Each structure stands twice: as C-alpha cells, then as structure tokens.
Write a protein that binds this DNA or RNA. Structure first.
Ligand code: TNJ
Ligand code: TNJ
Ligand code: CL
Ligand code: MG
Ligand code: MG
Ligand code: MG
Ligand code: MG
Ligand code: MG
Lengths: 637, 702
DNA sequence: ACGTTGTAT
DNA sequence: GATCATACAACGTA
DNA sequence: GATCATACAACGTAA
DNA sequence: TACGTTGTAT
C-alpha cells in the first residue's frame, strides 16, 4: 500500500495485473490509460539496484526495490496476479528489465518459477531490427495514453510474453550469474566475443547483449578518429549548425541541449549538459571544445556549475579543428534515430583529438581511460611518423614526454615506467603537487590536512621536506590515475591500442580525410572552369548567342548545336544576367579563370603522388600546431 | 541550514548577503570573502510578512531561516544577539527583484524594526549590462549609462561587446564579486528610515502590502500613472515598477489578440520555427528554449505551463496548440509530462492570429536585448479576447474573461458592422453568454447575464448535467474546471461521515468511449434523488460558480473594465485598422512590381539599345535612366534580367502578370477609398472565418 | 481561515 | 525529473 | 530549480 | 578486502 503506486480495486488474483514502468513520465501516461477494474501501475524512477549479490536486508534497504516488494506483496525470503515489466524499447529498457529479472530470480524465485512475471513488448515501428521488412515509435514517455493502452495495457491488442523451465532452471541460475556478477567482468567480455511465452534464460541473455554492445559502441567507448563519444560528437556538430562559432555571440545552453536532444540524441538532458560542461571546463579538458559565460564550475568543486538555463555557451577556437573541413565532403553521413535529419558519423580532425583531450568511460564488460597529452608534442610526433614510418616507440617517447594534464603539478612517474605504459597499452601514472593534481579539489585537500593538524601529527608547522613526503602518501597531494588505451578503431571494433598503433591508425584516417577533401575541391574547380569556358565563347558571340535565344522558340538544343556546347553549359548561358554583358564583367571572368586554372592541376597532382600529399600533411600538422598549440603545463620527471 | 558562514565574528566588519536565486547564491559563495562575508540563497519568493503574526513568520521556512541567520527574533528590541553587521538584499535586476526586495523590506520593517531603524539593512545595486573592449571592462546599472559607455568607446578601436545580464544567475562568480560583494568596487545603498519619515514609511508600505487595501492601490496607480536612501522612497518606486510591470507585461491581455505577453511570444516563436498546423511536431523543450532565449526572459516552468494550458481542449475553448504525448487529463490538468517528453505544434485556429503577420499589419518592437524584433500584437481575424478568454492576477486589479462561441461572436461583430447603433439587448439575442469547453449547462438567468455584459463584472454559475437511469443518478458532464476525481472524493467523504445514508454505492464508470460518467445509486426507489441532488449541488463541486471581470488592456494602452459592446466596438476598430494596413501593404507591393514590370517591357522593346548601352558605358545604370527616362529601381531590375527572359514566352508571361496586377491595383484602391466597400470585406471575412473555424455550442444555456 | 485560479520566483 | 512555497486579486464555502 | 539513487569497469586508499 | 572514485545513462 505505501508508496506512489496506483492500486487496483479488484482483489481477484486470477484477473488482477500489476505493471512496473520505467519512466515516471510513462508511468503518469500509464495511470491515465489503465483500466482501474484490474490494472495497477507502479513507476520505477530511474534504474533499479542490481539485487543479485545484495543480501536480503540490503534489498529492503533500497527504496526502489523495497517499494517493489511491498507492491508485489512478497518478502525476499520467497514466502496481484501478474507482474508485468513494462519498459521502453531502447537499450536501457532492456537493461532495466534484466535488473528486474535478477531481482525476481534470486530473491523471488517462487514468483518467477510459478509464472507470475511478464515482459511487455513495445513496438519499434516490429520489435526486431527490421528483419520482416526485407521480406518510428517514440518511447513510452512520448507516447499518447490511448496509444500506450492499445500497445501494452489493453489485453485485446497488447503484446505481453510470459517469462524458468525445469531443465532451464540450472542454466537460468547460471547464465544470469555470469551476467550480473560484479567480479565476473572478464566472463562477460569473453561472452560477448563468442556471441558476437519466453524462457527466462533466453530473455536475459538477449536483453543484456543488446545493452552491453550498445553501451560500448554508442556511448562510453570513443572513436579513434575524432576521439569523441556519440553524445560528445552530436553536441559539437549541433553547435556548429546553430552558428555558435568562436566569433558569434553566446547563446543559452538550454537551447543547444534542446536541439541536440530533439535532433540526434534521444536521451536525458542532464547527461548531455554534463558532457557539455566537461568539454567547457579548462580544468577538466586540456583543450576545451566549448567556451561559455556564467558559472561553469570551479577547480575545487567541478560539479558546482549553474544550470543550463542560466549559462550561455559557444564553440571555442580549438573546436574549429573538428568542423572546419566538415562541409567539404570529408565524412560519411548517417540518418538520426527518427530519420528526419542526417548526422555525421565522424568529424574531420585536423589534429588527433583522441590523444590531445582524452576521455574516461565505463561500459559493459570493458572501460576506457585515456589521459590528455600536449598538442605541439603530439603534432610533432605525427609529423615524424610520416617522415619515417619505421619509427619506434622509444624514438617517439623522446618527442612526447608523456601525458599533459591541465595542472601545474609534476608527474613523478619515471620515464622507464611511462615507456611500459605506451608499450603495453595499460598502466598508471602518478602526479605530485608542486598547484594540485588533476581532478584534485583544493578545498578538500585543506580538510584532509586539517584533520592531521587536529590530531597533532605535525606539531612544528604553524624540515619541510620530511613533512611533505609524509603528506604525499597520506593526503591527496599525490594521486595516481589509471591508463587504459581502449578505443573503437577504424575497423568498428573496440581494442586496446598502444601509442604506436594509435598514431599510425590515425594518420590512415587523416590521409583518407584529406584524400576525400581533395576530390571535393577538384570537382568544384573543374566544373567552374568548365562553366567559365563557355561564357567566354558566349562573350565572343553575344550577337549570335542572343539572336539565337530571341529567334529560336526553344534555344536549349539550338545553343548546343550552334557552338557544340553541353547542356550544363547552355543553362549557364541562359542564366546569365544582362549586367554580366558589360566589358568589366568579362575581365572579371578572364581574371577568375586564370587563377582557377592553376589550382586545377594541383589537386590531381597531389592525389596522384604520395610524396606530394605527405608533404602537405606534414605542413598542415605544423601549421595547426603553431596556431592552437601551447606550452607544456604539467612537467614530467 | 544552507547558509555559507564567515569565520570572523566582528559585527563591525561582518556582512550578510541575501541572494534571490539559489544558482546565484552558489555563485556568490564561490566569490564571497570567507573572512567576513556570509551568503544565504532565498529559494523563490518570500512570504508577505506584513499582516502575518510573529508566530506566522517563524512558521514559513524561508523567512524563518532568515530570522535564524540574522540572529534576531520577530520581537523588536532584540538586537543584543545580532550575528552579522550589514544585511544586504541581493536580487536580480528584473521587476521581481524589486518585488522580492519590497517583501524583504516589509519583513525588516514590521518584524525587525531595530535593524532598519539602526541602519543595518542595505540594498545591493546589480548591473544591467557588461561592456568590454579589450582589457577595459565597464558595467552599466542603467540603460542611460550603457549608451554613455558605448559613446565613450566610440573613440577607441574595436567593437565593444554589450553583455546584458538577464539576472544574477547568469553572472560569473568573479564578475559577481566586483559588482556586489567586493566593497572596493561594489554599489551598495544603505536603506535608512529618518525620524520624521517613520510615519509615512509605516503608512506607505502598508497600502502596498495590505491585503484589504486593493482599491487603495488601484487608485494609487491611476494617480502615479547617493550612499544612503530612504526606505519610503525606495519601496514606493520599487513596488510601482513591479505593479505596472505585472499589469502590462504579465497578467492582463491585449484586447486585439486577447493574449498575454508570454502567450504571444509562444505563438509567435512557434511560427518562426515553421510549426504550422501542417508541419511535424517538435519537442516542446525546443520551443520553450527559443521562446526564453529570443523574447521571454523568465522561467522555463512558467512558460511551458502557459503552453500546456493553450493546448488542453478542456481548458481552452479554442486551443492554440496541438501536441502529442501526455498533455494532462480533465481529472488532473496538472498531470502532464515534462516538456522534454511532449511534442507540440500550432493549431489550425492559431492561423487566425498569424496568417496576416508578415503582411505589414502590426507594429514591431525590439526584444529585451535588442538583437531581434518581436511583434507587439498579432493580427486577429476574430476577437480571440472573447473566444478563449483569459484569467489573470495583477497588482491592484485582476482579469477574468470567460470563453464564448465563435459563430455567435462573429455574427455579433457582423451585426455591429451593418448597424453600428445596435444595442446590447439586441446582441444578447445573438450571443447567449459564455461557452465553456464542457457539456454542462449554465444555470444563470438571461436577465442576470445581461447585467454581467453591461457592467463588465459579475459571476456566472454552471451545474452538472445528469439523468437518472435504472433508478440510479448518472452524471454525464461536469462543470468547467471540475475534476471528476475531486467530485467523487467529496461525495465519498460525505458517505464516510454518514451525511448521505440514503445513497448505496458510488461508482466511476468513466471510460474511453464516455468521457465522464459518475453513477450514484440510492438504497431504494422511495429515496428522492431530486432532494439529494439539490443537496450535492450545494455541498459538492457538481455546481460551481465563475467570477467575471472583463478587464483588459485596450487600444489606448491602458487597462479598463469594458462591457460587451465596448469590447466588440473597440475590436472592430482594431480589425478595420489592421485590414486597412494589410491592403496598403499589398497595394505598395503591387505598385512597386508594376513599376518594375513597366521597365522590363521598355527594355524588351528596346533590347538592342539597352545592351549596347551596357557594353559601351562603364557604369550603365545612369545611362539607362537618361536614355529611356527610367528610374534607378527600374534599371536595377533590367540589369538583373537573365538572358532566358529575353525569349518571347517570358515576355508574354510578364504582360499577363501585368494585366492581372493592374486588376488587383484598382480593386485595392477602391476598397481603400470607400468605407462601405471595406465594411463589406470585413463582413465577408468574419463570416468566412466563422464557417471554417466555428463550431456548435458546447455548454447549453437554460 | 482557507482554497482556489495563472504567470511569476 | 517529481517534490516542494511563495506574490497577486477576489469571490465563495465552511 | 537544488536534492535525491542506481548500472557499468577496476584502479587506489587505509582496513 | 569493500570501498571510493571516475562519466554517460535511467
Ligand atoms: C528520477 C531520477 C532520480 N531518481 C531519484 C530516486 C528514485 C531514484 N532511484 C531515481 C535521481 F536520483 C536522479 C536523476 C537525475 C540526476 N542525474 C536526472 F537527471 C534525471 O533525469 N532523473 C530521471 C531520469 C531518471 C533522476
Ligand atoms: C525552487 C522552487 C520551489 N521551491 C520549493 C521550496 C524551496 C522553496 N521555498 C521554493 C518551488 F516550490 C517551485 C518552483 C518552481 C515551480 N513553480 C519553479 F519553476 C522554479 O524554478 N522554482 C524556483 C524559481 C523559484 C521553484
Ligand atoms: Cl506580388
Ligand atoms: Mg529510455
Ligand atoms: Mg530573475
Ligand atoms: Mg508535473
Ligand atoms: Mg499556484
Ligand atoms: Mg555519479
């Protein structure tokens, strides 16, 4: 009874049904459409605790799962008629459902075995990946109440599957274990590699697979090319589309988030703006992508930033390295979730942003932790990798000292230990205050030292080398950071890559991006010079050209025959303004043609010779490093 | 509780700051000097602690924490335990900041008189703009000061960037310190009360914060229509700007379009986003975001709530917005999904306010920051002020206008055009009265309704429609803004108390086919349900009354109570003015094109000479004007002519376009010359719009 | 004395 | 992303 | 519009 | 050894 749960009037377990909703917005919609005669609704605000390794008392401690036990009416000792798990048809809905299956299997085994647990099947357009078409349905929160009933609640038109067989009781209790075990993380990763009414063992496996693979590919793991996660990539592109360049005026962040959510990113607003705040804080990102006005947090409390309604943002000058060459046919374009617009799959990075800024993410079965590096050092290293492709990691380490965090603290890790980090791909680096380390709160540090001062462990402080060495190991003045160079490569699969594999693989992405840029510019220079050629022919024969237009009824074929010109050439003559007949506009055309002719052969030459293109890459990397590069902040020793 | 405390305890150097926004308060705590500055954010508005008792002030959590932080009890003469030296009221520079300040002054004047009289209360002056040109940075608390800085920088290289602060929440912590917190560069005025001014200060503030003295405030608005500062001069000017602001820029609607500013900025912003009735739905969060960033600098919740109301068919007679998702239900109108979940779009009825927008029919004023332009009104093809009606609460006055039927109001406007001497008695035969979005009947008599539309004020009553079937009462339609669940709870509560022992059961059969169906079963047929029904009409919400106060901002730009004849008569003046502006606008477009088409035909007839002039003369624009006696605007059209247009077919297309435009030229000039010809147009458009958007009467009158 | 209404904090 | 408490006019029922 | 609790991978810290 | 962190997600 207790709790914000809609109760049903009838008490006949044979006809009564209880529904567990994922979103509170969807729950409100479910309460409006439920049949009070035999339908009960309970909203589950947010995700539910993974009550698999939690004790019986711990399950009752969590407010969400506790209220679930009260509504169901069964205690976790296994001592309404149908309990239906109703969640959206998105990767999290399957995740929230799996967490509820783990709750019903371990603590309420009598409920799942008796057949009182159900799984609601919402439509996508057709729950499959459009497999029948070869022969968009908004989420439950965005669905109308009447549509939500015809889809999940109304028995005459719903799709409800009944969720442990006698022979499957062994595999159901074993499959879910490896899936929902915190320690069995390696068991889940190796399970994905192999994997790369309704049974409870078949549902949990398929459900957790879609979420595990989705979270890695479409959230936590970044793309090697632009070094951005999908949510990160969709933010920068939407800001460029909104005209929020470095020269434009600031715009309220709420509008930017609103467009990102409605256009490309169908997820929560808080998670999106938090990613925007991270890209804007100079103390969190080495080379921020966003510049904003207002309260964007402080080094002591990075989370103490004003709401998106009070802050105005705009892209930074550094962000131009990812979008300046976007519209020049350099990247593929895929449709968005609903398909009404197009989104770029990648961003043309003039510099390897994956190593410059670095990203730390947590996925299912795997994680990623990449530290930031200096711009001029990584740029000069990429230039050297173009000159001598056989360069070794030891030779590269001489150029790039190591990570460069947005702090003036010193890195105490030895050069020999750093070499092992970039060689094996995994490791940890340590920093010591000179300025506090990265993601170290100044206010928090004072509280730690004050507690030591209160106990009287350092009575001389109102000689310091001995005290400092003690505080480095006791307080946060010395902190380490784990390094796990994991990322989604060009092959579309995650893999741990060393420093040499990253720089080598990114230059392949850059050479491909430039090769696509040159083809784009070539077609514009060639077609324009092709159009201007016809104009001069028309200029020489304006008398005949104009006479043909005025006399002939349909001049499009006639113009092609009289001068042997192409259909596209004729349209340019027909679209010529009388103002262009002046002698000055002819000289302007003759001048424009002389310049364009020089550029035409250059693009075909660079695309033909690998040496000529490599010299360009070596030039662009140095040019971008001289403008956006900066000195080393955190020294390595 | 949530108060940042200072380490020092010296009252001579200690200062306390009261912030209006919690976001701004957090920013103030980051920039405060912990040595002697303490900050406490005041979430939301503060209780009007003028007529509240000393115990009531301690009951409200907001003001209670203020007394604890200050260290003085609401009993005067308690300054012996004061914690801080200076009490500063820090609020944003929008009209509410002056309101929040006045509410804090009322708290300090009545309950903490020792603080204000001793001179420990201060008023912070935040800046309105931030001008930066290079290393130099200046602030501008007033608009007259902003231009002064811009004019001063005109002699300096660079383009100054004028940054207007929407509020303390949008300011940087470092910027907030240099302006309000840092004593070396802040602007803090001392609010003191002289000995002789104590009588007027205690009297002036009373009329402003007195609940009963509402009429005294209304006549006060009509008449009103340094290091230290007196509190009677500050509170009077502060509350005046808020009182006038709320009337003009919030609650009271404009007679022309019948919309409040927030409503108009929503409908206009949606038209700019292409959200016409035919376009696809867009997430409401996007619409609200644009409305806030473009035109409406206020809270997001209050704006989206106004959008939701305009979309609910059970709240608006003719909704302006059509949406998908959970937009609430008649039982719980507030049970609507958040703006991030709902997608909206303008309704077909909204076309009556925007179809003529781009046709030069309304004035355009700049927005708050001046970067965009906003329409002052919307060209309403029908008087939306009476169709939808708006309920508002202002300072000193309020407005409550009920909805009416479209076809009835249109026919009344048509009749007033034909016979301008038509009386209200003749109009009441056309317009029965209010028409709510419910099938419940209006029980007010026609004679009592006539007094409502004549005096402008009054009240109407509605009663639920019911019919007893199978010996049991069945309620089919409830009054307007009457919740079915609330009605059932009231009747059930009476059943629980034993005040209705004759009724057997109380069921709610409301389904998707029948919107409202409440059944009341008696214990026997001998029980008279007519006697029980009459009791429930007086006991439950089955019978509800609605206040009527036809107050609105007229064309003269001033609020006034207007009767039914003054509304339709004043709107027809607004409509005739907008149509007269539409025709002049289209006329000027037809004239300018005919002036351009004239030059093209001249060029076609002398194409040989025209081209020869272009090739020979370096700049042919003047030569063309002299050789053919054509105008500069005509020459530019000739120069921008494509060679394809020299074909004989494209000439015939222009001669045909001219023959049609010449017909449209004389037609518009004829309607603009004769008032009778224009009245027949208005009489036609009103009937045309009524046949398309009009609908039957929903709430019957009996 | 309370409780409504709707734009505002 | 549901939950809190206020201003303002003013009438209607407990 | 500040405040609430969870999933997911594994380092470090003092236990 | 459980516990605290980290950042996109509900
Ligand atoms: C309701 C929800 C929370 N509830 C509170 C408690 C019942 C819970 N177990 C889940 C929460 F604690 C935090 C949030 C946050 C904060 N990052 C959100 F941005 C947000 O949009 N949601 C909803 C998208 C889930 C939140
Ligand atoms: C914080 C705030 C509320 N608190 C709750 C309790 C601390 C208080 N004394 C004030 C509230 F009860 C409601 C709101 C609403 C809802 N109409 C807002 F839109 C909003 O932006 N704020 C702030 C603009 C004021 C709200
Ligand atoms: Cl035209
Ligand atoms: Mg979802
Ligand atoms: Mg404000
Ligand atoms: Mg709500
Ligand atoms: Mg309210
Ligand atoms: Mg967290």
């Amino acid at each position: 009874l207790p709790g914000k749960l809609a109760d049903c009037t009838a008490q006949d377990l044979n006809r009564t049904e209880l529904f567990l909703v994922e979103g509170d917005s969807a729950g409100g919609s479910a309460k409006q459409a439920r049949d009070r005669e035999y339908q009960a609704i309970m909203p589950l605000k947010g995700k539910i605790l993974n009550t698999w390794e939690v004790s019986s008392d711990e399950v009752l401690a969590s407010q969400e799962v506790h209220d679930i036990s009260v509504a169901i009416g069964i205690d976790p000792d296994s001592d309404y008629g149908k309990i239906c798990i109703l969640a959206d048809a998105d990767s999290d809905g399957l995740h929230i459902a799996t967490l509820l299956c783990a709750l019903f299997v371990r603590h309420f085994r009598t409920l799942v075995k008796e057949g009182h647990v159900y799984v609601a099947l919402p439509p996508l357009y057709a729950l499959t990946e459009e497999e029948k078409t070869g022969v968009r349905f908004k989420g439950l929160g965005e669905m109308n109440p009447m549509q939500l009933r015809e889809t999940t609640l109304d028995p005459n038109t719903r799709r409800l599957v009944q969720l442990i067989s006698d022979e499957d009781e062994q595999q159901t209790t074993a499959i879910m274990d490896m899936l929902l075990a915190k320690k069995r993380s390696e068991d889940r990763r190796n399970w994905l590699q192999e994997k790369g009414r309704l049974a409870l063992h078949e549902f949990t496996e398929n459900a957790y697979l879609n979420y595990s693979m989705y979270v890695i590919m479409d959230r936590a793991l970044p793309f090697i090319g632009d070094g951005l996660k999908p949510v990160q990539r969709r933010i920068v592109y939407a800001m460029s589309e909104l005209g929020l360049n470095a020269s434009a005026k600031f715009k309220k962040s709420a509008r930017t988030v609103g467009d990102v959510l409605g256009k490309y990113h169908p997820h929560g607003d808080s998670a999106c703006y938090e990613a925007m705040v991270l890209m804007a804080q100079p103390f969190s990102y080495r080379y921020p992508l966003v510049d904003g006005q207002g309260n964007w947090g402080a080094p002591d409390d990075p989370k103490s930033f004003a709401a998106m309604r009070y802050t105005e943002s705009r892209l930074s000058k550094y962000a131009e390295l990812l979008l300046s060459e976007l519209g020049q046919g350099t990247v593929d374009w895929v449709p968005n979730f609903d398909g009404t617009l197009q989104e770029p799959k990648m961003l043309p990075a003039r510099l390897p942003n994956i190593l410059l800024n670095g990203t730390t993410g947590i996925a299912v079965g795997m994680a990623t932790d990449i530290p930031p590096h200096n711009l001029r050092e990584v740029a000069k290293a990429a230039i050297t990798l173009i000159e001598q492709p056989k360069t070794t990691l030891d030779e590269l380490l001489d150029i790039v000292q190591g990570p460069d965090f947005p702090t003036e603290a010193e890195i105490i890790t030895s050069r020999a230990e750093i070499r092992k980090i970039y060689q094996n791909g995994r490791g940890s680096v340590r920093m010591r205050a000179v300025a506090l380390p990265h993601q170290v709160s100044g206010a928090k540090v004072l509280e730690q030292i004050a507690a030591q001062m209160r106990n009287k462990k350092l009575p001389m402080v109102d000689d310091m080398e001995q005290v400092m060495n003690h505080l480095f190991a006791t307080t946060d003045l010395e902190k380490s950071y784990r390094i796990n160079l994991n990322m989604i490569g060009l092959d579309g699969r995650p893999a741990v890559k060393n420093l040499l594999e990253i720089l080598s693989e990114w230059l392949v992405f850059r050479r491909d991006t430039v090769r696509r840029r040159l083809n784009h510019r070539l077609e514009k220079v060639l077609k324009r010079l092709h159009i201007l050629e016809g104009l001069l022919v028309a200029f020489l024969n304006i008398d005949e050209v104009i006479e043909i237009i005025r006399t002939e009824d349909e001049p499009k074929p006639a113009l092609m025959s009289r001068f042997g010109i192409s259909e596209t050439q004729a349209e340019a003559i027909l679209e010529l303004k009388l103002r262009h007949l002046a002698k000055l506009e002819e000289m302007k055309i003759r001048g424009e043609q002389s310049e364009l002719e020089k550029e035409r052969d250059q693009l075909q030459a660079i695309l033909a010779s690998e040496r000529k293109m490599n010299n360009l890459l070596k030039k662009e990397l140095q040019a971008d490093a001289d403008a956006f590069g900066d000195d080393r902040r955190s020294p390595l020793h």
